[PDB]
Structure formats: C-alpha cells, structure tokens
Design a protein around this ligand. Structure first.
Ligand SMILES: Nc1nc2c(ncn2[C@@H]2O[C@@H]3COP(=O)(O)O[C@H]4[C@@H](O)[C@H](n5cnc6c(=O)[nH]c(N)nc65)O[C@@H]4COP(=O)(O)O[C@H]3[C@H]2O)c(=O)[nH]1
Ligand SMILES: Nc1nc2c(ncn2[C@@H]2O[C@@H]3COP(=O)(O)O[C@H]4[C@@H](O)[C@H](n5cnc6c(=O)[nH]c(N)nc65)O[C@@H]4COP(=O)(O)O[C@H]3[C@H]2O)c(=O)[nH]1
Ligand SMILES: Nc1nc2c(ncn2[C@@H]2O[C@@H]3COP(=O)(O)O[C@H]4[C@@H](O)[C@H](n5cnc6c(=O)[nH]c(N)nc65)O[C@@H]4COP(=O)(O)O[C@H]3[C@H]2O)c(=O)[nH]1
Ligand SMILES: Nc1nc2c(ncn2[C@@H]2O[C@@H]3COP(=O)(O)O[C@H]4[C@@H](O)[C@H](n5cnc6c(=O)[nH]c(N)nc65)O[C@@H]4COP(=O)(O)O[C@H]3[C@H]2O)c(=O)[nH]1
Ligand SMILES: Nc1nc2c(ncn2[C@@H]2O[C@@H]3COP(=O)(O)O[C@H]4[C@@H](O)[C@H](n5cnc6c(=O)[nH]c(N)nc65)O[C@@H]4COP(=O)(O)O[C@H]3[C@H]2O)c(=O)[nH]1
Ligand SMILES: [Mg+2]
Ligand SMILES: [Mg+2]
Ligand SMILES: [Zn+2]
Lengths: 454, 454
C-alpha cells in the first residue's frame, strides 16, 4: 500500500519494525543514522517516515527539521518514536515538524492505526501537489480564499464524561473552536452542520460511541466526517473494533495534549485538502458547493448547513447568528463602471469578509450582489460587534478597481439576527436579518441594525 | 454503516444473522415471509437485502423478481442464501435478478466480505440516482456514450495455474474479454493498461498474489482497480488477510461459474458507475479524461493507456493495433456550413464509432478533427477488417445535420497499424498509422490503408 522508511540506530529495533510492516505488505526501507536517512528520503521520496528521536551524532529532532528544510521532502509525514515518558520529546517533536507520535515499546495496533491514517493523508497531499505543478499560468487566480492549515476548525466532542470533555475542549481551545455534546441524538444533528472533526468517547457510560460512529457513516451528510475515538488502552478488542468501523484514528486515555494536538491537525488538514480538491476544479450544478467568482460557499451549501444549525439551537443550547450584507449602490457600480470592475469589487469584498470572520463561520454568495455570514454558537450581542468589525474593514480602505490604476470607496449595510428558542426557523432568522438590512438603508446606509424575536 | 433487511421463514436463522450483523454495527430489520419483505423494502428502502431462497407460499426467487418489478426497490442489491449444493438455485437466482450469493451454513468471513462489497456498490448506486433525479432539462444531452452494464469489460487473470486460469477465461469469455498473465511482473504492466477488473490467485505457487495486490494499491495507475482474489476456503487467515490488503471481494475455490459471473458483474458495474460520476460532471485541465463535445476519451488519457499497452507488447505477448481516423473534407464542412453543423457531425461520428467498436477499446478525440482507436490484443489483419466495418457504418448512412432538417453524406480515411517486436514505441505506432491516413487520401479518400513494421 505504501513505501515506508524506518530510521533507528539500533539494528534490531529496525528489523522488528521492518518485519511487522512487510508482513502487512508495505514496502520498507531502512537507515541506521541521520545522513543516510536524509539521502534515502530525497532519493526514494517515501510515503511516510518512522523516525526514532534518540541517535548519536545527529538525533531524530535534527533529522526531522532537516527533512522539512529540504523542499523535496517537506511534504512527507514524519512519525517520531519516543520513550515511555515522552512529554519533553513530544513537545520538541512538534516544534521540529513531526506529524504524529508512537511510544516505545511499540503497540502493533497503534503502529498500524498511525500508518493507515497518514497513508490516507499522503494520498491527498500528493494529489494537491500534482495540481499545483500545473499552474504557473494563473495559479488559480480564479479563486481565492483558501485555508489549508490544520488550525482553526470546529471540533465536536461527543462525551458524557464532563471532566474529560471539558479538559479536551480547553486543550484544543487555543488553536481550535471546540464544542461539547453529551446527548448522542443532539450530537447527530450538530454533526451534520459545519464540523471539521468529531472526537468520540468509545468508553462512554450512557451511549455506545462506536454505534454513534456507525450512524455517522450511514448518512450522506456525515459520511466523510473525520472521527477520532478516545479509547481505554487495556481494552484491545474495542480499539480494533473502532478502526474496523471507520474511526480514522484513536487516542489512548488518559489523553496526551501533544498527541491530541497532532492527530487533530492531521485529520483537519486531510479534510481541507480533500474539500479543496472536490471544489476548485472545474464546474457543475447541484453538485456544486462554492461560488465560481468569489470562492465563497453557495447558497445551496449554506441553507443545508443552516438547517442543521437552527435545528440544534431549537433543542436548547447555543444560538446561531446570521449576517446579511449588501454592498451599497452596487448596481450603480455595474452601470457607471464596467461589469469587469464589478467583479473586482465582488472578489475584493469576498476576500476581506472571509479574512475578518472565523474559518468555522460560513461566508456565502447568497445572491448576485448580497452576501451572508452564518456564525455558529454566537449570540446577537456578539454578532452586532462582528458586523461592525466587517463594516470598518470595507469602509476603512479604498478598493483597487481598474486593474491597479484606480481606487474606489465602498460601504456596506448589514442586518443581524440570532435564533430564539423552540419555534424558530431558518426562514424566520434570515427574514429578521432581511428586515435589518432594509432599516440600515433607511437610516442612510453604511450601518448595522440588529433584529431580535420579539 | 448500512441498513440491512434479512428474510427467512425460520425464526432462528433470522435471529442468528441479525445478531452477527448488529454486532458489527449494521442496522438490521427482519421479515419472516415474502409479502412482509416486499412491504418493508418499499417502506424502508434498505441498503441491501439478504434473502433465503426456500420459503413456503412465496419463495425467494419470486420475492427477488418482485423486488425488481417495483421501480422503487429495483436498485437494491439482493443476496440469495442457497443450500450447500446450490447450482440450480444460483442459476435460477441469476435469472430472477440476484446480485450475489451466500452458501449455508453461513461463513462469517464470506458474509461480511459480501455485505461490505455490496454496501460500497450501493453508495455509488445512490449517487448516480441522485444525478438522474436532476435532469429532465437535458438528461446530459451534452453527453453521449455511456455504458453502464456490468458486461463486456477486460478482465485480467493473474494466475500461474494454467488449467484454472484457462477455465475461468472460458466461463468469462461469453460475456467478457478475458486476458491471462502468469508472470506477476508482466501483469503489473498489463494492469496499468485499460483493465476493468483483476482476478488474482491468492493461492498461487510461483508468486504471492497478496503481494501483487498490495503493489497495485501503492501506484496511482492501479490504485482504483477492482480486484477479486481466488482463495482456498480451508485457509481462513489467508482470506482475512486478502480483505485487509484491499481485495474487493473473494471467490471460493473450486470456482463456481454463477458466483464468478455475479461478483464480476458487481465489480465492473461499480467501476463504471464511479468513472461516469468522476467525468460528466463539469470541467477541468489535467484532471479530465473525456472530450466535452463527443464524450470520447482525451488524448492525454489515451497516451497514458497506450504506453502501458505497448510496453507490455514489447516484452512478448499479444500486439496492440491503432486506427487513425480522419473525416474527409471536414474543414470544408466548417466553411460552407456552420461550426454548429460541424459539432453535430463530430457527435454523430463519435457515437457511430463508439457503437461499432468494443467497450474495451479506446476510441478517442485525438485532435480537433482527427480520431484514434487503440485496440488491445489485436493483430494487424484484424484491425484492417475492423477499420472497414467502421468505414461502412459511416458512409452506409447519411448524417443528420441542421437540427434534423437537412441530411448529409460523410466518408472517412483510415490508417492502420500494429506493434511489432522489442524496439516498438507509441511514437512509432502512431507515426505508422499516420502514413496510412496520408496514403488513403492519395488513393482518393473513403479507404483504409495498413502499414506493417517493415
Ligand atoms: N463565530 C464567531 N464568533 C465570534 C467572532 N468574533 C467574536 N465572536 C464571539 O464573541 C465573543 C467575544 O469576542 P471578543 O470581544 O473579540 O473577545 C475575544 C477576543 O478578544 C479573543 N479572540 C478569540 N479568538 C480570536 C481570534 O481569532 N482573533 C483575535 N484577534 N482575537 C480572538 O478572545 C475573546 C473571547 O473569544 P470567545 O471565547 O470565542 O468569545 C467570542 C466569540 O464567542 C467571529 O468572528 N466568529
Ligand atoms: N476581534 C476578534 N476577531 C476575531 C475573532 N475570531 C476571529 N476573528 C477575526 O477573524 C480572523 C480569522 O479568524 P480564524 O479564521 O478563526 O483564524 C484565526 C484562528 O484560527 C487563530 N487564532 C488567533 N487567535 C486565537 C484565539 O484566541 N483562539 C483561537 N481558538 N484561535 C485563534 O489564528 C487565526 C488568525 O487570527 P487573526 O489574525 O486574529 O484573524 C482573525 C480575526 O481578525 C474574535 O473572537 N475576536
Ligand atoms: N434566467 C436568467 N435570469 C437572469 C439572467 N440575467 C439576470 N437574471 C436574473 O435577474 C436578476 C437581476 O439581474 P441583474 O439586473 O443583472 O442584477 C444583478 C447584477 O447587478 C449583480 N450580479 C449578479 N451576478 C453578477 C456577476 O457575475 N458579476 C457582476 N459584476 N454582477 C453580478 O447582482 C444582481 C442580482 O443578480 P441575481 O441574484 O442573479 O438575480 C438576477 C437573476 O435572477 C439571465 O440571463 N437568465
Ligand atoms: N479489440 C477488438 N478486436 C476485434 C474487434 N472485432 C474483431 N476483433 C478481433 O478479430 C477477431 C475476429 O473477429 P470476427 O471475424 O468478427 O469473428 C468474431 C465474431 O464473429 C464473434 N464475436 C466476438 N465478439 C463479438 C461481438 O461483440 N459482436 C459480434 N457481432 N460478434 C462477435 O466471435 C469471433 C471471434 O472473436 P475473437 O475471438 O475476439 O477474435 C476477434 C477479435 O480478436 C473489435 O471491435 N475490437
Ligand atoms: N463483427 C464483429 N463485431 C464486433 C466484434 N467485437 C465488437 N463488435 C461490434 O461492436 C459492438 C459493441 O461491442 P461491445 O462493446 O463489446 O458490446 C458487445 C459485447 O459486450 C457483447 N457480445 C456480443 N457478442 C459477443 C461475443 O461473441 N463474445 C463476447 N465476449 N461478447 C459479446 O454484446 C455487446 C453487443 O454486441 P453487438 O450487438 O454485436 O455490437 C458489437 C459489434 O457490433 C467482433 O469480434 N466482431
Ligand atoms: Mg535510538
Ligand atoms: Mg427458509
Ligand atoms: Zn414585531
């Protein structure tokens, strides 16, 4: 399935790993020191590299760093092999560029869970690299907005262990936007909304987290959704089961902050690369989920996502907010200047909008001239403030119209609203936002107006 | 992962199957008789149906037939459960519409191999049905050529057991185009060519068939190729392994003609559904393997396939033939009549070409006006005859030009060639055919001319 380069200074650890891997029909090469590994990686371009941190002369951290310095090998996932008490090693491993970790003595189930995961990721890395090897001509100048970190990202934690769920949220909260669900039926709804990753407790007390995963896998809206399962390290059949059922990778308890950070980045990056490929690239009807001109989301895609979000909010829990933006006198711009100038303005606006709103929000080409931002887990009072932030960035700087040679002042009107309890509807939320835009032009344009229920 | 409906009259066989399936986190419903099963299938629309052939009043064959009479349930894969000596059952099962089979007493590994396979197929069945639920508007009027049977199709048999390989080829030769390789290294090359399915002996003597399968899975050209493995049923570890490495489904030895025919249909049909979905649908550069106007293959796509075909032919074994077609006075048609009339001519010709040549051949839009057909396993003497067949169908009938309101005579000139020996190349092959087309015009067009290596 893949070509693996194993690196360790002890010729015995290398043979044991080599034997285990080729018994599962991987193609394995070896290196007993750093310089050898770097030369072989550049020559062979392996799919992944298993790298021991402890080596005399040049250690694994140095090798890992050097693999990222070389533009030829940068793209190859590196797994570091650490000792039992490997906190220091994992922290240093992260800053030296490692993709994930494995602990000695090596657990076979972890070993293969890890290789399969990064192998799957390597497929999409290679595919994306092929695309980029075509442009030069317009390096997709026909598209913009395009986030490909593993960072930001809405992470749904499905766990009835309050204490642990809350710790996992706090760990992921610096680099991500976590959300907790303890009811599995409520989680099913959230999960069909804009979620980048699900983390499920496979050892929960009140629901079967594997039965929940299988459910995600049997419905269109959640079938491609990445899933990490938290598992008890003493229950081996259960770990095997989870991987057979389509869990992407597993996190042993107690949950290690550095392992957590790493597996999460992996899965979110895999998803984003995958999505980026699905889109871009050419055109189509009902298929289609982005706007060609701006590179924002469709209305089609947005209403799908907004359906789940509002449904979740009506069963208690956090509200959703909606912004309806209209560019002031936009039709008058299409007349007195060209439609080509009009495109330039639409693209520039889309860029500033998406820049100043979270990756987990949903900025959309709602219509020809109107834009919408759906914001999960956001109250009206916060959404007003966000709208003012967007309003300032567009009004605070002139747009570059005629292919570099002219400046153009632009302002927007924004209407704002948030969900409100058991009766509320997507239709009703956007109607309130629509009233808000209408009143913002009644006050004299270039303003923000909130509309609440009731 | 999926919703399964199990049907059998003995409330105990049903409970045992139900228990096994829900233990793997499938969603299982049951029916104890025919009328119940039909009502439940229509109401629930399960992903697959497991159906016992023996029931009083209304047997499984009748149920199966009735499931295919209903336009609501037609699309659902049905697996028939037969007795030990089930030849009569399997033959009747095929003519009543079954997708595959399982033998009592039920083997758990077969059971799940069969469910996972048809589940994966059901994903693509549902995807295709969603597309078709959009048109009415132009039911892809912008696409023509589209084979979606499980029939025809080039099947590569990778096996060093002469007698068994040759017997499988005979069973497949009625409905398919089989090819035998006994050398795995030669088969690796063959498999990168235009192949719809590989069948590998997992119990071979001179090579490891699982190592061969693994190698297919680790290269872009062969990664997506359906594989069936022939297995000794007494060796369980080996069957399980094959499934882990990526074998799509397995075939018990000695090989049963009806089981063989069924799994082969599944795999080839799944592949074609998938390929049709990747194409059609919108547009793109280097990505894109079909011509938009005609729906034939790209030149890019063709040259890829041709390379593997010629590489294989230079290492011994059967030759490859190439037709180069040139529509006579085509630029003159573009002048006196419109480019819209030319498009209509290019579509008609494409349709007639594709219809009168095998599905395992590669008809292509080679340039703006010129066309190429590559033919695997075809000697020069046969290519000449095939070129004449095409030439007749195009000149034997007038084309319909102006949206039905004007008819038009059209002829073609064809150059024909075939590989020869160790030295040969794609470059040389096409060059030789190109001289054929040159000479065919020098005779006065509407002709065929072959060019032999030397
Ligand atoms: N969906 C969404 N919600 C938004 C957005 N902007 C603000 N909010 C919501 O409003 C709350 C208060 O935002 P803040 O006043 O800027 O106060 C913020 C801000 O000072 C800081 N902060 C958090 N994330 C970022 C960031 O990405 N960039 C910057 N510059 N500051 C941040 O942390 C504070 C608290 O953050 P939170 O706990 O998340 O609580 C946030 C969040 O729930 C947005 O673009 N999208
Ligand atoms: N005032 C305010 N502005 C907000 C807030 N949330 C988002 N923004 C604005 O939206 C930009 C993009 O947010 P992002 O997509 O989440 O992408 C963000 C996010 O992934 C991450 N980030 C930065 N600060 C924080 C933080 O405090 N908490 C978290 N979880 N992530 C952060 O870095 C990226 C870049 O951050 P920025 O340069 O600040 O650029 C931020 C910021 O200008 C907020 O709560 N308050
Ligand atoms: N079937 C059909 N319907 C048509 C056609 N042309 C316009 N419409 C419909 O008429 C509405 C108003 O068109 P508009 O006067 O150009 O007013 C437009 C235009 O001013 C602007 N706009 C839309 N697309 C673009 C664009 O790609 N570039 C620029 N610069 N402006 C655009 O936004 C406004 C709203 O556009 P829409 O939301 O699409 O709403 C459009 C659309 O639903 C057509 O050829 N066929
Ligand atoms: N790749 C390719 N090769 C072609 C094509 N047409 C003919 N050949 C090759 O030429 C041989 C003789 O063809 P035949 O004279 O029509 O004699 C044929 C024909 O009478 C019959 N036959 C086979 N397949 C078909 C079919 O799909 N339709 C029809 N009508 N007859 C067929 O069986 C005979 C032997 O078939 P083969 O053993 O395959 O041997 C075939 C095949 O190797 C083509 O479109 N594509
Ligand atoms: N004279 C001649 N013509 C050939 C040959 N091979 C292909 N063709 C022509 O190409 C058409 C399509 O072939 P196909 O795609 O393989 O699609 C074929 C093929 O899948 C299958 N088929 C028919 N006869 C045979 C056969 O004798 N052997 C096999 N393996 N398949 C057959 O039925 C489909 C329809 O067959 P047709 O209606 O005849 O329509 C055939 C036939 O007109 C050949 O060897 N000789
Ligand atoms: Mg060491
Ligand atoms: Mg029975
Ligand atoms: Zn009111």
């Amino acid at each position: 399935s893949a070509r693996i380069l194993v690196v360790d200074d002890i010729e015995a650890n290398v043979r044991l790993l080599e034997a285990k891997l080729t018994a599962e029909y991987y193609e394995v090469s070896t290196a007993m020191d750093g310089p050898t590994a770097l030369a072989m990686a550049a020559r062979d371009l392996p799919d992944i590299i298993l790298l021991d941190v402890m080596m005399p002369g040049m250690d694994g951290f140095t090798v890992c760093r050097k693999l990222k310095d070389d533009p030829t090998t940068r793209h190859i996932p590196v797994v570091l092999i650490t000792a039992l008490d490997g906190r220091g090693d994992r922290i240093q491993g992260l800053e030296s560029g490692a993709s994930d970790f494995l602990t000695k003595p090596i657990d076979d189930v972890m070993l293969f869970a890890r290789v399969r995961s990064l192998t799957r990721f390597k497929l999409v890395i290679d595919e994306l690299r092929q695309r980029e090897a075509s442009g030069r001509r317009m390096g997709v100048i026909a598209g913009a907005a395009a986030r490909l970190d593993g960072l930001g990202g809405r992470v749904l934690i499905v766990d009835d262990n309050e204490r642990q769920a809350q710790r996992v949220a706090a760990e992921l909260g610096v680099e991500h936007r976590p959300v907790i669900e303890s009811d599995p039926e409520k989680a099913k709804i959230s999960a069909g909304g804009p979620v980048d990753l699900v983390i499920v407790n496979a050892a929960a007390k009140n629901f079967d987290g594997l039965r929940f995963t299988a459910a995600l896998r049997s419905e269109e809206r959640t079938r491609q959704l990445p899933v990490l399962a938290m598992v008890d390290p003493d229950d081996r059949g259960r770990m095997v089961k989870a991987l057979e059922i389509g869990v992407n990778d597993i996190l042993s308890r107690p949950i290690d902050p550095q392992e957590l950070s790493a597996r999460v980045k992996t899965q979110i990056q895999r998803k984003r690369y995958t999505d980026y490929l699905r889109n871009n690239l050419d055109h189509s009807l009902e298929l289609a989920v982005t706007d060609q001109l701006t590179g924002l989301h469709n209305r089609r895609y947005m209403t799908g996502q907004l359906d789940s979000l509002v449904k979740r909010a009506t069963l208690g829990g956090d509200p959703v907010s909606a912004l309806l933006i209209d560019i002031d006198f936009f039709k008058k711009i299409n007349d007195t200047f060209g439609h080509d100038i009009g495109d330039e303005v639409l693209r520039e606006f889309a860029l500033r909008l998406a820049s100043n709103v979270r990756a987990i929000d949903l900025p959309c080409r709602y219509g020809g001239e109107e834009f919408v931002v759906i914001m999960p887990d956001t109250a009206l009072a916060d959404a007003l403030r966000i709208a003012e932030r967007i309003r300032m960035h567009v009004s605070g700087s002139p747009f570059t119209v005629a292919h570099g040679r002219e400046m153009l002042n632009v302002t927007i009107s924004i209407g704002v609203s948030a969900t409100a309890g058991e009766g509320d509807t997507p239709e009703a939320l956007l109607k309130r936002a629509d009233e808000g835009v209408y009143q913002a032009k009644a006050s004299g344009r270039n303003a923000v107006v909130g509309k609440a229920a009731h």
